[PDB]
Amino acid sequence: PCKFYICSNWEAIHKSCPGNTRWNEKELTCT
C-alpha cells in the first residue's frame, strides 16, 4: 500500500513511496 507498480510492456517494475506517504491510485501518485 506504500509502493505501486509501473507497467511497461506488460512489465512490472518495482517503485516505493517516500517517507509516510501511500500510493493514491486516483491521482497516480503517492500522497
From TrEMBL:
Protein name, please? Der f 23 allergen
The record lists the lineage as: Eukaryota, Metazoa, Ecdysozoa, Arthropoda, Chelicerata
Q: Which domain of life is it from?
A: Eukaryota
What are the Chitin-binding type-2 domain coordinates in residue numbering? 1-31
Q: List the disulfide bonds.
A: 17-30
